[PDB]
Amino acid sequence: HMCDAFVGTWKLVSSENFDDYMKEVGVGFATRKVAGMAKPNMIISVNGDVITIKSESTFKNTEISFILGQEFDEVTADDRKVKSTITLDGGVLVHVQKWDGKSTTIKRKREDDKLVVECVMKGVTSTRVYERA
Numbered sequence: 001h002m003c004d005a006f007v008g009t010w011k012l013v014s015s016e017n018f019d020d021y022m023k024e025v026g027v028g029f030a031t032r033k034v035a036g037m038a039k040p041n042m043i044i045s046v047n048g049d050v051i052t053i054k055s056e057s058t059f060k061n062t063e064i065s066f067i068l069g070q071e072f073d074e075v076t077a078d079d080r081k082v083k084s085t086i087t088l089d090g091g092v093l094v095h096v097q098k099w100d101g102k103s104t105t106i107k108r109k110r111e112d113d114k115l116v117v118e119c120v121m122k123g124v125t126s127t128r129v130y131e132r133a
């Protein structure tokens with residue numbers, strides 16, 4: 001029951017500062033433009049200890065499955081090869097990606113009827129708000 005309130009299909013309804021976040025991460029111009037246009041659906045499911053998060057968009061479909069606290073290798077939508085660990089901290093899913101001596105953190109939180117995604121790279125934060133599909 002660890003992630004019950006996250007489970008479901010979620011659609012992006014607003015974004016702030018995502019271009020800047022992508023710049024800070026090192027994403028190039030053409031990928032930023034196409035990726036920034038996307039309105040993904042985020043599909044979260046749980047089977048036993050295994051959490052699966054899919055992102056489906058016109059840019060790039062991704063899928064990760066993981067156990068909390070157990071590092072895994074992830075190829076991101078922008079084609080970074082990262083080492084990821086996802087933990088629950090006070091009811092927030094905290095997803096850390098490490099690559100090339102860099103780190104970024106994506107937090108997913110349930111707030112009211114929304115799922116709020118906060119993406120941080122150094123001093124740059126992007127906030128993306130999803131609603132149930």
Ligand SMILES: CC1=CC(=O)NS(=O)(=O)N1Cc1ccc(Cl)c(Cl)c1
Pocket residue numbers: 022025027031032035040055076077078106117119128
């Ligand atoms: C971080 C993030 C938040 C989200 O809510 N949806 S998303 O856009 O698929 N995404 C992954 C991502 C997509 C594209 C790029 Cl270019 C980068 Cl760096 C990351």
